Design a protein around this ligand. Structure first.
Ligand SMILES: N#C[C@@H](Cc1ccc(O)cc1Cl)c1ccc(O)cc1
Ligand SMILES: N#C[C@@H](Cc1ccc(O)cc1Cl)c1ccc(O)cc1
Lengths: 219, 11, 224, 10
């Protein structure tokens, strides 16, 4: 596979736009969205060339580790052209004000909003997003050799995407560093988010959705 | 509840 | 100012190794925990001094300096540990006389998990043949990536620019330079994971009353 | 307190 045709495979793997068709209301809307998105995330993963050639254990471990980070990366990309807004879905657009209405959510909104603004400032391109979202899954903390090859391939594709911008070799290096540094900011917001959701689950104040419940219990 | 494995193994 | 001058400044700024004696008796929960936290408290003093020597750090808002160090200290400690451990496979070189295997992990409930992560990430750095000058740039990047906001961006770009310069002096192709930079930076999220697990572990040990009164460590821990 | 002391008065 050329880097170009790997990137087109990620373009083809992109899940559909998910709508919620829907205080307690905001939080029910987020958990319901996450449960539907998790169904589409599994189909996405399986369309990444080589992913289904990994051991089932490895497939399961990578999605268990990375699912919240992959959801938040998708949220940041949908929000990028909508300053002050988190485009959870066309029918679930939220600002920090709506966030204030549930304890601990303000912090998470004002973190997702910040990282989104960094991506906005770097002018993150769609093909860059495709590559980093796949890298988040594949880099999450016979099969092990296949995983290293697959991660190497997506990394090679991101380098190619940056090369296509036509900026200097120096500026290609700086941009690659800048993008990959934002990854630890996605993983940070992911950690704060997973803590807040586990806490909401332990208090049973958010509805127990089967796929989301199973993905949260992994952690 | 094994929906992750179910979805990984079917389409 | 130049990338080479920034790398020479970091090299000179490297902390001296903190000396801690192995306990006389075989490790207990209490003796391992006393050993590791005494080391961290002493390294934290040297870390603050190292941070002040990064060009531009002391020009940040005091409140930014504090937030960067409260956010990153355990990752900075772990990156130092992995570097000290890179020439010694199977071993975690916490200090010259504090050389721990998966074995000694047994002495504290949950610590073996942390040692495994540290040993595995150390292996990745070893396979990549991490170089001294690369390590120096990556350790400063961990701190800085954890009007003051514009300065921080500028200071992080200067360090990034130095890491790019260090990889260029290796003389590999432009594509291979990009891949090496990607491979190093993607290891940062793994250092940070080991940091999150280690911090949660340490906070739980503080709850069990196993942790001693080390004022700086306690402060840094309560920042979480 | 100790962090601020080490940053500013050391
Ligand atoms: N905001 C938010 C979400 C994270 C998220 C990101 C992207 C999505 O597409 C869907 C969600 Cl739920 C969240 C849910 C529960 C919780 O306790 C804390 C945060
Ligand atoms: N591993 C480890 C240490 C952290 C550490 C890292 C690097 C260092 O150079 C020095 C230390 Cl103490 C640790 C301490 C307490 C605890 O509950 C869990 C882990």
């Amino acid at each position: 596979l050329s880097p170009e045709q790997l990137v087109l495979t990620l373009l083809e793997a992109e899940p559909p736009h998910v709508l919620i068709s829907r205080e307690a209301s905001m939080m029910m809307s987020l958990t319901k969205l996450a449960d539907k998105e998790l169904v589409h995330m599994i189909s996405w993963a399986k369309k990444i060339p080589g992913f289904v050639e990994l051991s089932l254990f490895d497939q399961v471990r990578l999605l268990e580790s990375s699912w919240m980070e992959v959801l938040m990366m998708g949220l940041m990309w949908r929000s990028i052209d909508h300053p002050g807004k988190l485009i959870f879905a066309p029918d679930l657009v939220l600002d920090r004000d709506e966030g204030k209405s549930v304890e601990g959510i303000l912090e998470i909104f004002d973190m997702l909003l910040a990282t989104t603004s960094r991506f906005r400032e770097l002018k993150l391109q769609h093909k860059e997003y495709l590559c980093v979202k796949a890298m988040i899954l594949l880099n999450s903390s016979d099969s092990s050799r296949k995983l290293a090859h697959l991660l190497n391939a997506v990394t090679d594709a991101l380098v190619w995407v940056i090369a296509k911008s036509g900026i200097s070799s120096q500026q290609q290096s700086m941009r690659l560093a800048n993008l990959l540094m934002l990854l630890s900011h996605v993983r940070h917001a992911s950690n704060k988010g997973m803590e807040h959701l586990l806490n909401m689950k332990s208090k049973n104040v958010v509805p127990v959705y089967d796929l989301l419940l199973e993905m949260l219990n992994a952690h | 509840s094994h929906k992750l494995v179910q979805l990984l193994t079917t389409t």
